Short mmCIF file of C-alpha atoms in Angstrom, two decimals:
data_model
loop_
_atom_site.label_atom_id
_atom_site.label_comp_id
_atom_site.label_asym_id
_atom_site.label_seq_id
_atom_site.Cartn_x
_atom_site.Cartn_y
_atom_site.Cartn_z
CA UNK A 1 0.00 0.00 0.00
CA UNK A 2 1.68 3.16 -1.31
CA UNK A 3 1.96 6.66 0.15
CA UNK A 4 -0.57 9.12 -1.22
CA UNK A 5 -0.07 12.47 -2.87
CA UNK A 6 -0.65 15.74 -1.05
CA UNK A 7 -4.30 16.74 -1.51
CA UNK A 8 -4.80 20.16 -3.13
CA UNK A 9 -8.39 21.12 -2.31
CA UNK A 10 -7.92 24.11 -4.64
CA UNK A 11 -8.00 22.02 -7.84
CA UNK A 12 -3.98 5.51 -1.09
CA UNK A 13 -5.73 8.81 -0.31
CA UNK A 14 -9.19 8.96 1.33
CA UNK A 15 -11.99 10.00 -0.97
CA UNK A 16 -12.64 13.73 -1.27
CA UNK A 17 -16.37 14.55 -1.13
CA UNK A 18 -18.40 17.73 -1.60
CA UNK A 19 -19.76 19.09 1.67
CA UNK A 20 -23.22 20.72 1.32
CA UNK A 21 -23.32 24.18 2.89
CA UNK A 22 -26.48 25.82 4.21
CA UNK A 23 -26.17 28.55 1.61
CA UNK A 24 -29.29 30.46 2.75
CA UNK A 25 -28.23 30.79 6.40
CA UNK A 26 -25.92 33.77 5.77
CA UNK A 27 -27.11 36.72 3.73
CA UNK A 28 -25.07 38.00 0.81
CA UNK A 29 -24.60 41.37 2.53
CA UNK A 30 -23.53 39.80 5.84
CA UNK A 31 -20.89 37.61 4.18
CA UNK A 32 -19.45 40.72 2.53
CA UNK A 33 -19.49 42.66 5.83
CA UNK A 34 -16.59 40.43 6.94
CA UNK A 35 -15.07 40.00 3.47
CA UNK A 36 -16.50 36.58 2.58
CA UNK A 37 -18.03 35.57 -0.72
CA UNK A 38 -21.67 34.48 -0.61
CA UNK A 39 -21.91 30.92 0.71
CA UNK A 40 -23.44 29.71 -2.57
CA UNK A 41 -20.15 30.50 -4.33
CA UNK A 42 -18.07 28.61 -1.75
CA UNK A 43 -16.67 25.14 -2.27
CA UNK A 44 -16.40 22.85 0.74
CA UNK A 45 -15.09 19.32 1.05
CA UNK A 46 -15.17 16.37 3.40
CA UNK A 47 -13.13 13.20 3.58
CA UNK A 48 -14.56 9.71 3.73
CA UNK A 49 -13.80 8.19 7.12
CA UNK A 50 -13.52 11.58 8.89
CA UNK A 51 -16.90 12.81 10.13
CA UNK A 52 -16.61 16.39 11.33
CA UNK A 53 -13.87 17.40 8.87
CA UNK A 54 -14.74 20.35 6.62
CA UNK A 55 -12.32 22.17 4.32
CA UNK A 56 -13.30 25.46 2.66
CA UNK A 57 -10.77 26.72 0.09
CA UNK A 58 -10.22 30.52 0.08
CA UNK A 59 -13.81 31.88 0.29
CA UNK A 60 -12.66 35.48 0.73
CA UNK A 61 -13.63 38.37 -1.52
CA UNK A 62 -10.67 39.79 -3.50
CA UNK A 63 -8.34 41.85 -1.33
CA UNK A 64 -10.24 41.22 1.92
CA UNK A 65 -7.61 38.79 3.24
CA UNK A 66 -5.45 41.89 3.70
CA UNK A 67 -7.90 43.17 6.31
CA UNK A 68 -7.64 39.98 8.36
CA UNK A 69 -3.85 39.86 8.11
CA UNK A 70 -3.59 43.45 9.34
CA UNK A 71 -5.91 42.70 12.26
CA UNK A 72 -3.72 39.76 13.31
CA UNK A 73 -0.41 41.62 12.97
CA UNK A 74 -1.38 45.14 14.04
CA UNK A 75 -4.47 45.01 16.28
CA UNK A 76 -4.96 41.63 17.95
CA UNK A 77 -1.29 41.62 18.98
CA UNK A 78 -1.99 44.64 21.22
CA UNK A 79 -3.22 44.60 24.79
CA UNK A 80 -5.60 43.55 26.08
CA UNK A 81 -4.47 40.01 25.24
CA UNK A 82 -2.28 37.20 26.52
CA UNK A 83 0.88 36.89 24.47
CA UNK A 84 4.12 34.95 24.22
CA UNK A 85 5.99 38.27 24.51
CA UNK A 86 4.56 38.89 28.00
CA UNK A 87 7.30 36.58 29.28
CA UNK A 88 9.90 39.28 28.56
CA UNK A 89 8.12 42.49 27.49
CA UNK A 90 6.06 44.85 29.62
CA UNK A 91 2.63 45.84 28.34
CA UNK A 92 3.93 49.33 27.57
CA UNK A 93 6.84 47.94 25.56
CA UNK A 94 4.53 45.81 23.38
CA UNK A 95 2.63 48.96 22.36
CA UNK A 96 5.58 49.92 20.17
CA UNK A 97 5.36 46.77 18.04
CA UNK A 98 3.99 48.42 14.90
CA UNK A 99 6.20 51.53 14.84
CA UNK A 100 9.25 49.30 15.34
CA UNK A 101 8.41 47.12 12.33
CA UNK A 102 8.02 50.25 10.20
CA UNK A 103 11.47 51.32 11.42
CA UNK A 104 13.06 47.99 10.47
CA UNK A 105 11.26 48.30 7.14
CA UNK A 106 12.53 51.81 6.35
CA UNK A 107 16.19 50.99 7.08
CA UNK A 108 18.50 50.75 4.09
CA UNK A 109 20.58 48.06 5.81
CA UNK A 110 18.98 44.73 4.91
CA UNK A 111 20.36 42.20 7.39
CA UNK A 112 19.36 39.67 10.02
CA UNK A 113 22.45 40.58 12.08
CA UNK A 114 20.29 42.69 14.38
CA UNK A 115 17.76 42.34 17.22
CA UNK A 116 14.52 40.73 16.16
CA UNK A 117 11.53 43.06 16.12
CA UNK A 118 8.57 42.27 18.36
CA UNK A 119 6.60 41.22 15.28
CA UNK A 120 9.41 38.78 14.42
CA UNK A 121 9.28 37.35 17.97
CA UNK A 122 5.49 37.00 17.95
CA UNK A 123 4.44 33.38 18.23
CA UNK A 124 0.99 33.21 19.84
CA UNK A 125 -1.83 35.48 21.03
CA UNK A 126 -4.88 34.34 22.99
CA UNK A 127 -8.22 36.11 23.21
CA UNK A 128 -11.32 35.58 25.31
CA UNK A 129 -11.27 32.82 27.91
CA UNK A 130 -7.74 31.79 28.84
CA UNK A 131 -7.02 28.06 28.54
CA UNK A 132 -4.79 26.99 31.45
CA UNK A 133 -2.62 24.13 30.19
CA UNK A 134 -1.72 22.84 33.67
CA UNK A 135 -5.32 22.57 34.88
CA UNK A 136 -6.33 21.51 31.34
CA UNK A 137 -9.50 23.60 31.81
CA UNK A 138 -10.34 27.23 31.14
CA UNK A 139 -9.36 29.73 33.82
CA UNK A 140 -11.36 32.33 35.70
CA UNK A 141 -8.59 34.91 35.13
CA UNK A 142 -6.37 36.07 32.26
CA UNK A 143 -9.61 36.98 30.49
CA UNK A 144 -9.43 39.46 27.62
CA UNK A 145 -12.24 40.71 25.36
CA UNK A 146 -12.89 38.60 22.29
CA UNK A 147 -12.74 40.91 19.23
CA UNK A 148 -16.22 41.29 17.82
CA UNK A 149 -15.36 41.35 14.10
CA UNK A 150 -13.54 38.02 14.40
CA UNK A 151 -16.59 36.67 16.23
CA UNK A 152 -18.86 37.80 13.39
CA UNK A 153 -16.57 36.09 10.87
CA UNK A 154 -16.40 32.93 12.99
CA UNK A 155 -20.17 32.81 13.55
CA UNK A 156 -20.95 33.09 9.83
CA UNK A 157 -18.58 30.31 8.79
CA UNK A 158 -19.93 28.06 11.55
CA UNK A 159 -23.52 28.80 10.46
CA UNK A 160 -22.93 27.93 6.80
CA UNK A 161 -21.35 24.65 7.98
CA UNK A 162 -24.52 23.70 9.89
CA UNK A 163 -23.51 24.89 13.39
CA UNK A 164 -26.05 27.60 14.09
CA UNK A 165 -25.87 29.06 17.57
CA UNK A 166 -22.07 28.93 17.71
CA UNK A 167 -20.45 31.58 19.91
CA UNK A 168 -16.85 32.72 19.48
CA UNK A 169 -15.42 32.75 23.01
CA UNK A 170 -11.78 31.57 22.90
CA UNK A 171 -9.35 32.48 20.13
CA UNK A 172 -5.69 31.68 19.64
CA UNK A 173 -3.60 33.34 16.92
CA UNK A 174 -0.35 31.63 15.93
CA UNK A 175 2.49 33.23 13.96
CA UNK A 176 4.83 30.88 12.11
CA UNK A 177 7.93 32.00 10.22
CA UNK A 178 10.30 29.97 8.09
CA UNK A 179 12.51 29.55 11.18
CA UNK A 180 9.70 28.55 13.56
CA UNK A 181 10.28 25.57 15.82
CA UNK A 182 8.31 22.48 14.88
CA UNK A 183 6.67 21.74 18.24
CA UNK A 184 3.34 20.14 19.11
CA UNK A 185 0.91 21.26 21.87
CA UNK A 186 -13.67 18.79 27.58
CA UNK A 187 -16.36 18.11 24.99
CA UNK A 188 -15.73 18.41 21.25
CA UNK A 189 -19.26 18.38 19.83
CA UNK A 190 -18.98 22.06 18.90
CA UNK A 191 -16.64 23.01 16.04
CA UNK A 192 -13.36 24.84 16.10
CA UNK A 193 -12.64 27.15 13.18
CA UNK A 194 -9.11 27.33 11.75
CA UNK A 195 -8.10 30.17 9.40
CA UNK A 196 -4.84 30.50 7.47
CA UNK A 197 -3.27 33.52 5.76
CA UNK A 198 0.04 34.04 4.00
CA UNK A 199 2.50 31.34 2.93
CA UNK A 200 1.36 27.77 2.42
CA UNK A 201 1.79 24.81 4.74
CA UNK A 202 1.01 21.10 4.97
CA UNK A 203 -1.59 19.84 7.42
CA UNK A 204 -1.02 16.21 8.42
CA UNK A 205 -4.36 14.59 9.27
CA UNK A 206 -3.83 11.55 11.46
CA UNK A 207 -4.29 8.10 10.00
CA UNK A 208 -7.54 6.28 10.61
CA UNK A 209 -5.92 2.96 11.50
CA UNK A 210 -3.14 2.82 14.08
CA UNK A 211 0.41 3.41 12.79
CA UNK A 212 -1.05 4.53 9.44
CA UNK A 213 0.63 7.37 7.59
CA UNK A 214 -1.22 10.70 7.88
CA UNK A 215 -3.21 12.22 5.05
CA UNK A 216 -1.47 15.34 3.75
CA UNK A 217 -3.06 18.51 2.45
CA UNK A 218 -2.09 22.04 1.49
CA UNK A 219 -3.23 25.05 3.46
CA UNK A 220 -3.35 28.02 1.11
CA UNK A 221 -3.91 31.64 2.11
CA UNK A 222 -7.58 32.10 2.98
CA UNK A 223 -8.33 28.40 3.52
CA UNK A 224 -10.62 27.61 6.46
CA UNK A 225 -10.92 24.28 8.26
CA UNK A 226 -14.03 23.53 10.30
CA UNK A 227 -13.60 20.61 12.67
CA UNK A 228 -15.87 18.96 15.19
CA UNK A 229 -16.51 15.60 16.80
CA UNK A 230 -14.28 12.78 15.62
CA UNK A 231 -12.13 15.15 13.56
CA UNK A 232 -11.70 17.85 16.22
CA UNK A 233 -9.58 15.35 18.15
CA UNK A 234 -7.25 15.28 15.13
CA UNK A 235 -6.63 19.05 14.90
CA UNK A 236 -3.17 20.39 15.69
CA UNK A 237 -0.84 23.27 14.88
CA UNK A 238 1.24 23.37 11.69
CA UNK A 239 4.50 25.22 12.48
CA UNK A 240 6.24 24.22 9.21
CA UNK A 241 5.99 27.02 6.64
CA UNK A 242 6.57 26.25 2.97
CA UNK A 243 8.94 28.76 1.32
CA UNK A 244 7.20 30.89 -1.28
CA UNK A 245 7.38 29.73 -4.91
CA UNK A 246 10.22 30.94 -7.10
CA UNK A 247 9.35 34.42 -8.34
CA UNK A 248 6.05 34.66 -6.41
CA UNK A 249 6.54 36.41 -3.06
CA UNK A 250 2.88 36.31 -2.05
CA UNK A 251 -0.09 34.30 -3.33
CA UNK A 252 -2.19 36.19 -5.86
CA UNK A 253 -5.09 36.42 -3.39
CA UNK A 254 -2.82 38.56 -1.19
CA UNK A 255 -1.81 40.79 -4.12
CA UNK A 256 -5.31 42.09 -4.86
CA UNK A 257 -5.95 45.48 -3.21
CA UNK A 258 -9.04 46.10 -1.12
CA UNK A 259 -12.05 47.73 -2.79
CA UNK A 260 -11.91 51.51 -2.92
CA UNK A 261 -15.47 51.75 -1.55
CA UNK A 262 -16.61 49.45 1.22
CA UNK A 263 -20.11 49.42 2.71
CA UNK A 264 -20.76 51.70 5.67
CA UNK A 265 -21.72 48.79 7.96
CA UNK A 266 -18.69 46.77 6.85
CA UNK A 267 -16.18 45.37 9.32
CA UNK A 268 -13.51 45.16 6.64
CA UNK A 269 -11.57 48.40 7.00
CA UNK A 270 -9.18 50.11 4.58
CA UNK A 271 -5.49 49.24 4.81
CA UNK A 272 -3.01 52.05 4.25
CA UNK A 273 -0.05 51.70 1.90
CA UNK A 274 2.55 51.79 4.68
CA UNK A 275 0.56 49.33 6.82
CA UNK A 276 0.41 46.80 3.99
CA UNK A 277 4.17 47.10 3.47
CA UNK A 278 4.65 45.70 6.98
CA UNK A 279 2.18 42.88 6.30
CA UNK A 280 3.67 42.01 2.91
CA UNK A 281 7.26 42.01 4.20
CA UNK A 282 6.28 39.80 7.14
CA UNK A 283 4.08 37.39 5.16
CA UNK A 284 6.89 36.89 2.64
CA UNK A 285 8.29 34.30 5.08
CA UNK A 286 5.37 33.65 7.40
CA UNK A 287 1.94 32.11 7.82
CA UNK A 288 -0.68 33.30 10.33
CA UNK A 289 -3.29 30.96 11.84
CA UNK A 290 -6.51 31.81 13.66
CA UNK A 291 -8.28 29.18 15.77
CA UNK A 292 -11.70 30.00 17.24
CA UNK A 293 -13.55 27.91 19.81
CA UNK A 294 -16.71 27.98 21.88
CA UNK A 295 -16.28 27.65 25.65
CA UNK A 296 -19.62 27.84 27.49
CA UNK A 297 -22.03 24.92 27.05
#
């Protein structure tokens, strides 16, 4: 029995299957409010043998991925949050993250023989309920507000996947660079939502039989994985970043600018030229992941 090829959901291996989305559960205007295409235009796939596994290739409107990258790099990394930098940086010091990256970016010396910027040292950010790894339950403290626009995005994707009533309550944002270390880390009826932006990576989905080789698949910028039940047990972080293709610094979906006119109720905001320079420079060698979970009931 041979080793399968890497599945590319964007074009020896378990059978790929269309997943039917509840296309009338999210209005066309609401999907655009957070930068998503209308659900009817989305593709979604399952895998035979893996109930609870959903894969949604890049369902984002052109240029709207930029809004979600900038939120992860520039806004969600700011207090109030819990952060890997809190080990060494004071809360006041972390407030200078964005201006520092712009300073590194404006320098004419291009070199890695220098201190790493805070953005380059960013590895994880948690929002909402804090998950205490010792206790292996959620904590009563280290609580930070869950950003509402990410909750609106999470709730819509969960609804279209058949999980109406889902509440975004615990988020973790992971930042992986080419030099990231390759480490590895209740009820699971409710889904967790996993978003990817930037460079590509390979998700290894655990074998069904014991000692079986995992099923491989590409995570492209904008891809969303919805996982619950049997398949939520199989979710894990992907710290390995694939280097960008020869000649192509960023995927084409990250090279489309945002619309000039957005709606006036939209949560997608404009992204300035200098702000996108920081995102584009960073994402040249990085992938950002967003994981959203429900906590209460």
